[PDB]
Design a protein around this ligand. Sequence first.
Ligand SMILES: Nc1ncnc2c1ncn2[C@H]1C[C@H](O)[C@@H](COP(=O)(O)OP(=O)(O)OP(=O)(O)O)O1
Ligand SMILES: [Ca+2]
Ligand SMILES: [Mg+2]
Length: 430
Amino acid sequence: GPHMATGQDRVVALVDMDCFFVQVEQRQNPHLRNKPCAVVQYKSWKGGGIIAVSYEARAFGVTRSMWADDAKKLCPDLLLAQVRESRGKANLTKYREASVEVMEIMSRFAVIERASIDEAYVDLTSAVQERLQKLQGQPISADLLPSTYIEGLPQGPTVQKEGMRKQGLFQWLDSLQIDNLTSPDLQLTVGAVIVEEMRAAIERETGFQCSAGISHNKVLAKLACGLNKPNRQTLVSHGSVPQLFSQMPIRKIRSLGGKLGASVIEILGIEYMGELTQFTESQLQSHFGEKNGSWLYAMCRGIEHDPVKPRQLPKTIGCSKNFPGKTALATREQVQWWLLQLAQELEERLTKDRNDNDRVATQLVVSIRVQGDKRLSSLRRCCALTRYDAHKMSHDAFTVIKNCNTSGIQTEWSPPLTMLFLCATKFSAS
DNA sequence: ATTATGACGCT
DNA sequence: AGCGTCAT
Ligand SMILES: Nc1ncnc2c1ncn2[C@H]1C[C@H](O)[C@@H](COP(=O)(O)OP(=O)(O)OP(=O)(O)O)O1
Ligand SMILES: [Ca+2]
Ligand SMILES: [Mg+2]
């Protein structure tokens, strides 16, 4: 009843760029704009691996992870842009720098948590309170929400999508009580107005379009964001949760896309998020552990407490290359050359990071994979990172891994290496 | 023969 | 610490 918390204390948004790497390439090369196009890395093997796909191309069934030669079978006129190559490896600098552009604009509106290269969570709670004071009990015009969907509406008593969007919006605004400044539905609505403004600013100043979700926590904001893409934003109210979750596959919720989600389905014999409400907190804890059990118990009711962490910069800077099939490194000279290439890119990124962000990494992590292992990493060892120098870093990396060489021969490397990975971590202010 | 990342949890 | 999971 009156003591039962409802997880409506915050307004949280998740902003995610539409087909991000593609938009970066389309801004640079107008010939790619408004075309079925994809971004690919490498080229020799099957025309390269697709990593981002424009919405026009998705209509043909082109997807991420598809080989470009295969995508071309679905979409003969597919245009491609290739990821830059430096020191023999894909170099993602252009996209990282474009990411910074967006993150800096968002940070003008509120504190953000960088969640990936192309998305950030936003805690809008305080910004909403402020805007509410400005409004002075003034109603919110639908004009202020020109790209917003209200999940679950319209309902009750309509052919085209934009018209549906507006009907839903009008039902929502018609029911709002703007008299109450602590009304969670009102707070979300004002949050959506701010997110419209943030999204407009992003597009004006970068050229990039994005989608967004607005709700009361990160998981719902994230789910909302994906409900209407591209170039639209979705508000998921506390009230919409029971209907939304009643047919929502468990795997769609962030963190349940893998083995745990699979275990939830298997052990409990259920399919949808809403079916979780029927179990006690202790029951869920017994199957999935104290922490997961509590989290699932609240989450299936639309409640989640993870804070938007104030962190705009990545916590690690890493460089990685796979050496698949026949290209696996089988000589010490090979291993040393590629560690150097990786270390050189890393030094470059580290030096720029130190200048821009006044911090220095203190730990170097070195990871490899050996031919045969089905695991991402076979071995992960750390050493001290005392100087931003590529030759030293690569020499150190070699030293920590050199014992993995089964070969009785000094020159040879066995079993061959199918992945190398250098990662700088444990930053300190400088 | 996706690849190149990046965060966080467990013990 | 080194490993595993989940994600973009
Ligand atoms: N598995 C991956 N491997 C390599 N790069 C990836 C991978 N997943 C995502 N990326 C890169 C390319 C994407 O443009 C960018 C953002 O990813 P993501 O948000 O999942 O999709 P997207 O922005 O391309 O399309 P959407 O409009 O569906 O969000 O990160
Ligand atoms: Ca995206
Ligand atoms: Mg994303």
